[PDB]
Design a binder for these strands. Structure first.
Ligand code: MG
Ligand code: MG
Ligand code: MG
Length: 297
DNA sequence: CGTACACCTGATAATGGAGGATACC
DNA sequence: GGTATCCTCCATTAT
DNA sequence: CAGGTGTACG
C-alpha cells in the first residue's frame, strides 16, 4: 500500500476516477424554485479507503468520506465556498487532460456564477442549467421539461493534450490501469501453461487521442477496441518492453492505492520469468500463488 | 518449445446520479 | 422563511 | 478491470 501524494499524481488519479457534478433540484422553498449544488466526488473500493484519507489531507482536510455502495466509499466536497477556495485553484494550476477536463471547465463556470450569487437569480439559473446540459449525462427529464428553451453551452473541447508529467501517468494508471498475470493453456510448453504478463489501460473511446499518445510516451504498446462498445485498451504484451520500459517507469513513478501491491507482485512474476523459472513446475506454482494473492488485501 | 499480437468474454465496483434531513443566517 | 451542507442509498457501464 | 484463446513465427 502507497499513499504519498504528489500534485500531478492526484491530477492523474482524478482524470481516472473523479467526477465534477452539478445538481439542480426542484424545491418550492427557493425563490427561483430550484436548489443548485456543485459536487466534486471520487469513489473507490473500500480497500483503497486509506487513499481517500490521504486525498482529504491533500486537500486541506476538507470534505467528507462516506459509504457510497456495498464495497465502496466516496470522498466528496459539496461546499461551494470550499470548492472555490481550494479545488478550483488546484485544477487551474494542474490541469486535467481527459474529457473530464470539459466537465471541469463547465463545473468551474457554474461555481463562478454561484460565487456572485447569480444562481439565486432567474437568468443565473437558466445559464447554470445550460452549463449542466453539457456536463456528464446532461439534463434529467424533469430539468429538460422545466427549461425546454435552454441551449446547451458548447462543450469546450480542448486540443493536443499532451501528458504533463510522469506522475500524471502514475496516478491515471492507479485508477484505470491494470497489471495482468495470465496463465494460458499451451500444448507446446512442457509445463502446459504460458505465463504472460500484460500491462493495460482502459478508457472510453472519446479519449482515443490520449490513448494513442501513450504509445509514443512509453515507447511501446498498441491500442485495441472492445468489439462490445466504445472502449479502448492500451496494451503492452511484449515481455522485453515490460522489463525495459514499464517496470522501470513505475519503479520511479509509483502506483498509489492497493494496486501498488499488485504491481509489486507482478514484478515478482517478471523476475521468475527473467530467470526462466516459469518454464519449470516450481516456478509455475510460484506464479500461480503470486497470481492468486493479487488484488486482495 | 516458447512468445506475442489479435480477438474474446465475465465480473462488479464505478460512473454520476438520487432523495430526505438538518444547519445556518 | 430562504439558503447551504450533511447523510444515505442506487442502476447501468466504464472499467 | 480482468481473465482468457488462436496461431504465426523464430
Ligand atoms: Mg475512470
Ligand atoms: Mg479504479
Ligand atoms: Mg471496477
Amino acid at each position: 500500500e502507497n499513499s504519498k501524494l504528489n500534485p500531478w499524481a492526484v491530477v492523474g488519479f482524478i482524470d481516472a476516477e473523479g467526477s465534477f457534478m452539478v445538481r439542480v433540484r426542484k424545491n418550492s422553498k427557493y425563490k427561483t424554485g430550484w436548489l443548485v449544488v456543485a459536487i466534486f466526488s471520487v469513489t473507490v473500493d473500500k480497500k483503497d479507503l486509506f487513499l481517500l484519507e490521504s486525498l482529504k489531507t491533500f486537500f486541506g482536510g476538507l470534505g467528507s468520506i462516506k459509504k457510497s455502495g456495498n464495497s465502496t466509499f466516496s470522498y466528496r466536497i459539496e461546499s461551494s465556498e470550499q470548492l472555490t477556495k481550494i479545488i478550483l485553484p488546484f485544477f487551474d494550476k494542474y490541469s486535467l487532460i481527459t474529457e473530464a477536463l470539459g466537465d471541469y471547465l463547465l463545473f468551474k463556470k457554474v461555481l463562478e456564477l454561484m460565487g456572485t450569487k447569480e444562481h439565486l437569480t432567474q437568468r443565473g439559473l437558466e445559464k447554470i442549467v445550460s452549463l449542466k446540459a453539457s456536463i456528464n449525462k446532461g439534463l434529467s427529464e424533469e430539468l429538460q421539461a422545466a427549461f425546454p428553451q435552454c441551449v446547451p453551452t458548447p462543450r469546450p473541447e480542448i486540443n493536443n493534450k499532451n501528458i504533463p508529467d510522469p506522475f500524471w501517468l502514475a496516478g491515471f494508471v492507479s485508477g484505470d490501469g491494470s497489471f495482468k498475470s495470465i496463465l494460458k493453456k499451451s500444448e507446446s510448453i512442457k509445463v502446459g501453461f504460458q505465463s504472460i504478463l500484460v500491462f493495460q489501460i482502459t478508457q472510453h473511446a472519446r479519449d482515443v487521442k490520449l490513448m494513442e499518445s501513450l504509445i509514443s510516451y512509453l515507447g511501446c504498446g498498441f491500442i485495441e477496441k472492445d468489439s462490445r462498445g466504445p472502449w479502448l485498451y492500451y496494451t503492452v504484451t511484449n515481455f522485453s518492453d515490460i522489463q525495459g520500459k514499464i517496470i522501470p517507469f513505475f519503479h520511479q513513478y509509483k502506483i498509489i492505492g492497493s494496486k501498488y501491491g499488485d504491481y509489486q507482485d507482478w514484478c515478482k512474476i517478471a523476475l521468475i520469468m527473467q530467470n526462466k523459472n516459469h518454464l519449470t513446475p516450481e516456478g509455475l506454482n510460484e506464479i500461480r500463488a503470486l497470481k492468486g494473492g493479487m488484488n486482495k488485501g
